[PDB]
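Tokens in:
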């Protein structure tokens, strides 16, 4: 399949009905409020269609036509994807109030926060496994011709089995060409993926630490690249450097990234360095 920008539809709502399942509100049960969203609250709950745990996003009452549209676009987009490492959309509630988007529940939440709360708690093979899952989800999106544009650990969700899934459908996470000529491509997402690799091996540390955006920009311009995180295998940091190649054409593709990570998993000694 191929990704279809919902906003190319003469009527954006059409994309919603096509790629998103309409769920009767009587099936949704909001239990608790997790966090805050751009258009409303982010909650957890159960969905009974075997009851299952689900993440639930609500649209703040008094919403404008555009706010509703932009909110639901997340579902018109997510609904076109079907991959183990891309957040699963259960459906949406639009024929009732409040409007909602229901997605699979991820117990461990956001990857950056998860890692910070579990600093140094995982084996190298487990962390590599997380990075593998993310690259796989991204390879799939890139294959669908979907450029994420905001790939970062805060935008990756983690389940109880440590499976990592791409979500969220930033300067220090963005490629130079993307910042200068606003040229966003999968190669641009690869640079971002490299930063994610750093976040993961650094257990949620902030990229470039206290550096300002301008400093980061200048640093990169001066051919500066983030050093290897503490106890981070050399092969992994090398992969990071490959993702941060000035020339976007020189950066590896997600398919090649997954292969490199898989070879490391198959040959654990390669991570000894």
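Residues out:
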């Amino acid at each position: 399949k191929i990704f279809i920008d919902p906003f190319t539809f003469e009527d954006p709502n059409e994309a919603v009905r096509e790629f998103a399942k309409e769920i009767d509100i009587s099936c949704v049960k909001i239990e608790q409020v997790i966090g805050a969203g751009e258009f409303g609250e982010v909650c957890s709950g159960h969905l009974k269609l075997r009851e299952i745990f689900v993440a639930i996003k609500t649209l703040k009452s008094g919403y404008t036509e555009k706010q509703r549209r932009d909110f639901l676009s997340e579902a018109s987009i997510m609904g076109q994807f079907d991959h183990p490492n891309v957040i699963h959309l259960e459906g949406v509630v639009t024929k009732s109030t409040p409007v909602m988007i229901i997605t699979e529940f991820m117990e461990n939440g956001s990857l950056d926060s998860f890692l910070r709360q579990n600093d140094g708690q995982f084996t190298v093979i487990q962390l590599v496994g997380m990075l593998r899952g993310i690259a796989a989800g991204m390879k799939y999106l890139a294959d669908m011709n979907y450029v994420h544009r905001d790939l970062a650990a805060r935008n990756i969700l983690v389940n109880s089995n440590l499976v990592c899934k791409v979500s969220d459908f930033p300067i220090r996470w963005t490629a130079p060409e993307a910042i200068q000529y606003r040229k966003f491509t999968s190669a641009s997402d690869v640079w971002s993926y490299g930063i994610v690799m750093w976040e993961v091996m650094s257990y949620g540390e902030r990229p470039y630490w206290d550096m300002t955006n301008q400093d980061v920009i200048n640093a990169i311009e001066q051919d500066y690249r983030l050093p290897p995180p503490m106890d981070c295998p050399s092969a992994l940091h090398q992969l990071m450097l490959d993702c941060w190649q000035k020339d976007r054409n020189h950066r590896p593709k997600f398919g090649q990234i997954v292969n490199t990570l898989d070879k490391m998993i198959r040959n654990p000694n390669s991570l000894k360095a």
